[PDB]
Every structure is written in C-alpha cells, then in structure tokens.
Amino acid sequence: PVTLVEARYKSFSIKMLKDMKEGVKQYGPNSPYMRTLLDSIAHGHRLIPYDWEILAKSSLSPSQFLQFKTWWIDGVQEQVRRNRAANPPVNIDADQLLGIGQNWSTISQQALMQNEAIEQVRAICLRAWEKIQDPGSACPSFNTVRQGSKEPYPDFVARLQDVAQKSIADEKARKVIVELMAYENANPECQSAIKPLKGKVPAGSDVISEYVKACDGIGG
Amino acid sequence: PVTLEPVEARYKSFSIKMLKDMKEGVKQYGPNSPYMRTLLDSIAHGHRLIPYDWEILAKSSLSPSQFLQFKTWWIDGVQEQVRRNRAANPPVNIDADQLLGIGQNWSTISQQALMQNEAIEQVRAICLRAWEKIQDPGSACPSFNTVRQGSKEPYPDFVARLQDVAQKSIADEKARKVIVELMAYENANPECQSAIKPLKGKVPAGSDVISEYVKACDGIGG
Numbered sequence: 001p002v003t004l005v006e007a008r009y010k011s012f013s014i015k016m017l018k019d020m021k022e023g024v025k026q027y028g029p030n031s032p033y034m035r036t037l038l039d040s041i042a043h044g045h046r047l048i049p050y051d052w053e054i055l056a057k058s059s060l061s062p063s064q065f066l067q068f069k070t071w072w073i074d075g076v077q078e079q080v081r082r083n084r085a086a087n088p089p090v091n092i093d094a095d096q097l098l099g100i101g102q103n104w105s106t107i108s109q110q111a112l113m114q115n116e117a118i119e120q121v122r123a124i125c126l127r128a129w130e131k132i133q134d135p136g137s138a139c140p141s142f143n144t145v146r147q148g149s150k151e152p153y154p155d156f157v158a159r160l161q162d163v164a165q166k167s168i169a170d171e172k173a174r175k176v177i178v179e180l181m182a183y184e185n186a187n188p189e190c191q192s193a194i195k196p197l198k199g200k201v202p203a204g205s206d207v208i209s210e211y212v213k214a215c216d217g218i219g220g
Numbered sequence: 221p222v223t224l225e226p227v228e229a230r231y232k233s234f235s236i237k238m239l240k241d242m243k244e245g246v247k248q249y250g251p252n253s254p255y256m257r258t259l260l261d262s263i264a265h266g267h268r269l270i271p272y273d274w275e276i277l278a279k280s281s282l283s284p285s286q287f288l289q290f291k292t293w294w295i296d297g298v299q300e301q302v303r304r305n306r307a308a309n310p311p312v313n314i315d316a317d318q319l320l321g322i323g324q325n326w327s328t329i330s331q332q333a334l335m336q337n338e339a340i341e342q343v344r345a346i347c348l349r350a351w352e353k354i355q356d357p358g359s360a361c362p363s364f365n366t367v368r369q370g371s372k373e374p375y376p377d378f379v380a381r382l383q384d385v386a387q388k389s390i391a392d393e394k395a396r397k398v399i400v401e402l403m404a405y406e407n408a409n410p411e412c413q414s415a416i417k418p419l420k421g422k423v424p425a426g427s428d429v430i431s432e433y434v435k436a437c438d439g440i441g442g
Binding site for chain 2 (some may be wrong): 192195196
C-alpha cells in the first residue's frame with residue numbers, strides 16, 4: 001500500500017501473505033475469521049487496484065482468481081452506470097477502477113488517486129470477495145436447502161444465512177427471506193416445536209434466537 | 221302481507237320478484253344459510269304475516285320433500301304452545317286452531333286478517349323455529365357422536381358442522397354454547413388435539429374460546 005510527503009508504494013511482507021494463504025486454504029475464503037482479517041487489512045491501509053491483484057493472486061486457488069476477476073468486472077460495470085447519472089457527474093470511468101488501460105496501468109500513475117476512488121474500489125472488491133465459491137461446490141437455490149432428518153437446527157439456519165449472502169445483495173431483503181424460510185424448510189419436529197412461537201419476539205431479541213431456542217434437543 | 225291503513229285491514233299478496241329471489245336463494249345456498257336466515261327474518265319482522273302467508277311463502281319456495289318437514293314441525297311446535305298457554309295464569313285464549321290457520325273460525329283470509337299481536341308474535345316464533353329444522357335435500361340429521369374431524373380436514377370446516385348439528389337439536393342457545401366448546405376438543409384428530417391441549421381453560425381478553433381454539437390450528441389441516 002501507499003504511505004502519505006509524497007506517494008511511496010511498498011509491497012507486503014512475507015508474513016502477511018503467509019497468514020492470508022494459510023487462512024484461505026484451511027478455513028475458506030468467507031469464513032468469519034477471513035472476513036475479519038480482510039476488513040482489518042483493507043480499512044487500515046490504502047489499497048490501489050495493483051494491490052488487490054497482488055493479494056488475491058497470492059492467496060486464492062486458480063479456480064477462484066477467475067471468479068474474483070469476473071465479479072470485479074461485473075461490479076465496476078454496474079458502478080459506472082451509477083457514476084455518470086450524478087449531478088455533477090464524477091470523473092470515475094471503468095479504467096480507473098479496474099486498474100488497467102492507458103493512464104492507469106503502472107503503480108506510479110495509480111498512487112496519485114483520490115479518496116473517493118479508493119472508497120469506491122474497496123466496496124466492489126469486498127463484494128467480489130463475498131461471491132467466491134468453495135473449491136468443490138456450486139451455489140444452490142433456496143429449494144434445495146432443507147433441514148434433513150437427524151441434523152441440528154442451527155446447522156440448518158447457518159446454511160440459509162450463507163445462501164442468502166451469496167445471492168441477494170440487499171440486507172433488508174436478506175432478513176425477511178431468511179426469517180420466512182427458517183420455518184418452511186424445517187423438519188416436522190422443529191415445525192411442531194416452533195409453531196406456538198411464530199411471530200412473537202419478547203424484548204430486544206432476534207427472531208432466530210427464539211427459533212433456535214425453541215427446538216433444542218430435537219435432532220441427533 | 222296485510223296493511224293497517226285508514227282502521228281497515230286489507231290483504232295483498234306477495235310480489236313476483238319477492239318470491240323469485242326467495243326461491244333462487246333456497247335452491248342455491250340452502251334453506252339455512254346465513255344469508256337466507258337474515259333475508260327471511262327481514263321479511264318476517266318488517267311485515268304482518270298471517271298463517272295463510274307462511275303457507276304460501278313456504279309452498280312456493282321449498283322442495284316437495286321439505287314442505288313435509290316444515291308443516292310437521294309447525295304442527296309439533298303448536299302442540300307444545302298450548303301446554304304453556306293454559307298452564308300459565310292467567311290462561312290466554314289462544315287455541316290450536318288459531319295458530320294453525322284451520323278450523324271453522326280461522327279458515328279464510330278475511331277471518332284471518334283480524335288477529336291480535338300476541339298471536340302474531342306467537343305464530344312468528346313458531347314458524348321461525350320450524351324453518352330451522354328443514355334438512356338439506358338429501359341428508360338426515362346426524363348425532364353428536366358421528367361429527368368427528370377426519371384426517372386432512374381443516375378445523376373451521378369441522379366446527380361449522382358442529383354448530384350446524386347443535387342448531388337443529390337443541391332449542392336453548394345457552395346450552396348450545398357450552399356443548400360445542402367441549403365437542404371441539406373431544407372430537408378432533410390428534411394433530412389438533414396435541415396443538416390445542418396447552419390452551420384449554422383460559423382465554424386472555426376480548427375473545428371467546430372457539431376462536432382461540434382455531435387460532436392454534438392455523439396450518440395443521442391438509
């Protein structure tokens with residue numbers, strides 16, 4: 001990252017890259033430990049689009065760098081359409097956020113970027129990292145995730161909370177969908193255990209807290 | 221119906237539309253739908269119905285196998301009114317041949333057009349209870365042991381059958397209220413008995429028992 005009297009760009013150490021690879025390989029790219037570590041890296045530095053490529057290339061499988069680059073390209077193609085419709089329109093084109101082109105293809109040209117382009121490339125890079133799949137799997141639809149027999153209830157809810165995180169982009173639309181689907185796809189035991197509790201949050205609680213509290217020793 | 225205009229009491233028959241919609245109601249919804257009960261009550265309470273007009277309105281708007289029941293329960297409901305019309309002091313001068321519209325003194329329209337209002341309320345309360353025992357066109361009234369909720373049947377469709385049985389068998393409604401609330405638990409399938417068991421014996425406020433029962437079986441039926 002770059003350090004603010006002029007712009008000086010220094011690569012990462014070996015320890016940071018070793019920790020990132022050892023995290024991604026063992027726990028997954030979207031385990032909560034990796035999200036916490038990645039947000040601590042990104043919010044605590046000044047990342048140019050060179051550094052997202054250096055970080056993601058040296059940490060991900062080659063089957064996952066393709067997905068990272070693809071959803072980065074999709075995110076900047078949608079962010080450009082909201083950038084020209086401004087009043088005044090901002091001078092943030094596609095080739096300034098992708099880190100390629102004629103005027104933006106070397107680290108000396110990129111190190112003189114403003115705060116708004118930094119905070120705009122950060123959100124689309126994080127949303128790109130949020131969509132990277134696990135090595136052997138594909139993202140399923142909501143018709144497939146059902147609590148099978150002999151399976152705990154929070155293990156069932158924590159699959160829905162991830163499926164609704166890869167697909168749907170708005171959090172308010174995530175909450176209503178997972179609150180609805182937590183009752184329809186449940187086992188008959190947890191459905192009968194959860195039916196007298198529906199639509200009743202007592203005080204300062206989440207709905208799914210009382211839901212997982214309700215059916216508790218049911219499966220096993 | 222008859223009109224008391226200057227007094228003088230003239231007789232006028234029903235219209236054609238007033239008989240036509242009564243027949244089209246009875247034929248389609250049933251004789252004891254909630255629509256026909258209010259329609260018949262609005263006809264009866266807002267007019268002056270002598271026992272000729274009840275027979276005209278009942279003959280022109282019912283099946284041939286249901287006039288045989290209306291006339292029968294009319295006869296049985298006047299066989300028990302005189303037992304409470306001479307055995308209560310002072311005994312009133314209302315004989316059997318006045319509420320039935322037959323005999324020698326009460327057999328023509330001009331004779332029947334001059335009855336007193338106590339006899340009018342009495343024949344009204346007999347006929348409205350006679351109408352509540354007419355059966356659907358192919359059915360006999362079952363007993364309380366045979367109205368059991370079958371599997372894959374919703375709950376309000378079962379409680380409605382219970383109230384339909386209890387409206388034909390019991391004449392007192394205060395005893396109707398306390399039997400449906402017991403049979404609603406006693407005659408349900410186990411999928412609603414297990415869902416209704418923790419609720420028995422308490423209602424919070426502003427409610428009754430039979431709606432707090434049906435709230436707890438919201439999605440259990442098939």
